[PDB]
Write a protein that binds this ligand. Structure first.
Ligand code: NAP
Ligand code: 388
Ligand code: BR
Length: 312
């Protein structure tokens, strides 16, 4: 399989990247070093993950060692919800750059459509537990993102967790200067996203699938929840191909023309997860995996559901 996908900014993006949410700060430097050593060239980051400094140590060491050139890496981060304000976006991007110890990002995303009240807290709450919004809107935040391209801080801009109507709002923005390059959304066999993916792809927006393994380490996991990695139907497809279930789960979005960003801090799994370019799922396998959709979401959050721009 070709390793990169062409974006609508003219740059190429590796279809496989390393996720870093929940990667402990004392483990993520080694995780990223191992990832780069075994072939990863795309790292998915975010300020809210609280580990960008440690990710950056790894990137910098591998650049210093000349394992890779900067041009060969594709580093992604995301603007957190408490920084949607005009006067805060550049500094948020710059903090991420300094933590990652980069002078540009390959891709910078609006992490969620919703803006929250600025301050120290990532989820500012009222006394009844509702998130405190910002009266910022997605269009003005987008204009701020466009500024970052024009200042040389980022090569591409995009969105994350935007629903169909919100993507459309951006595409219809008066005076739109740069289209979003990417919409990064949850996607796996239990949340197959056919409608949003077709919409975005039809508009030339590349979709990145997050939580492709079903985020078994998500902090809110409950006993009852479905488990992709343990689903005997998916294990059977893996066995047929002499691959792991995780490998099937990673190859699946690749064959849908998606980018995919599985997270691991386990060196053996980091390497396993990369060994997905030498086998093919059949069309029948693909349709079978699609058939498992149950509209089940890892990522949703009750405290934010009354925000005007909550996407789900
Ligand atoms: N834009 C957004 O709003 C958003 C939201 C969610 C996620 N993301 C991004 O997407 C990335 C991936 O999603 P995720 O972290 O939610 O979950 P995920 O990648 O679906 O699953 C990660 C979990 O799977 C385990 N795992 C990894 N490889 C495995 C393998 N080969 N066999 C068995 N278990 C394996 C990991 O364990 P170990 O680490 O212990 O090996 C970890 O517990 C995130 O890290 C983040 O970068 C973005
Ligand atoms: O958002 C992510 O990337 C992964 O999930 C989280 C990560 C961290 Cl470090 C903290 C919290 C989350 C988390 O709770 N994410 C879910 C979330 C967030 C905001 C909104 Br508007 C809706 C929503 F569903
Ligand atoms: Br939101």
């Amino acid at each position: 399989m070709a390793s990169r996908i062409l974006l609508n900014n003219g740059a190429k993006m590796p279809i496989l990247g390393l996720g870093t949410w929940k990667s402990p700060p004392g483990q993520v430097t080694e995780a990223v070093k191992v990832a780069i050593d075994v072939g990863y060239r795309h790292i998915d980051c975010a300020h809210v993950y609280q580990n960008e400094n440690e990710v950056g140590v790894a990137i910098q060491e591998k650049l210093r060692e000349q394992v890779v050139k900067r041009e060969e890496l594709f580093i992604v981060s995301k603007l957190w919800c408490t920084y949607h304000e005009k006067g805060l976006v550049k500094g948020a991007c710059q903090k991420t750059l300094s933590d990652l110890k980069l002078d540009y990002l390959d891709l910078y995303l609006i992490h969620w459509p919703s803006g929250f009240k600025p301050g120290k807290e990532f989820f500012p709450l009222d006394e009844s537990g509702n998130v405190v919004p910002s009266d910022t809107n997605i269009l003005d935040t987008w204009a701020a993102m466009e500024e970052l391209v024009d200042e040389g801080l980022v090569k591409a801009i995009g969105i994350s967790n935007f629903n169909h109507l919100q993507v459309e709002m951006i595409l219809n923005k008066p005076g739109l200067k740069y289209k979003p390059a990417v919409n990064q959304i949850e996607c796996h066999p239990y949340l197959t996203q056919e409608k949003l993916i077709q919409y975005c792809q039809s508009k030339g927006i590349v979709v990145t699938a997050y939580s492709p393994l079903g985020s078994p380490d998500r902090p809110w996991a409950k006993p009852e929840d479905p488990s992709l990695l343990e689903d005997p139907r998916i294990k059977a497809i893996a066995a047929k191909h002499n691959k792991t279930t995780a490998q099937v789960l990673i190859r699946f979005p690749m064959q849908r023309n998606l980018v995919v960003i599985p997270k691991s801090v386990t060196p053996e799994r980091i390497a396993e997860n990369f060994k997905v370019f030498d086998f093919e799922l059949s069309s029948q396998d693909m349709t079978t995996l699609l058939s498992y959709n149950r509209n089940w979401r890892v990522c949703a959050l009750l405290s934010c559901t009354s925000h005007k721009d909550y996407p789900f």
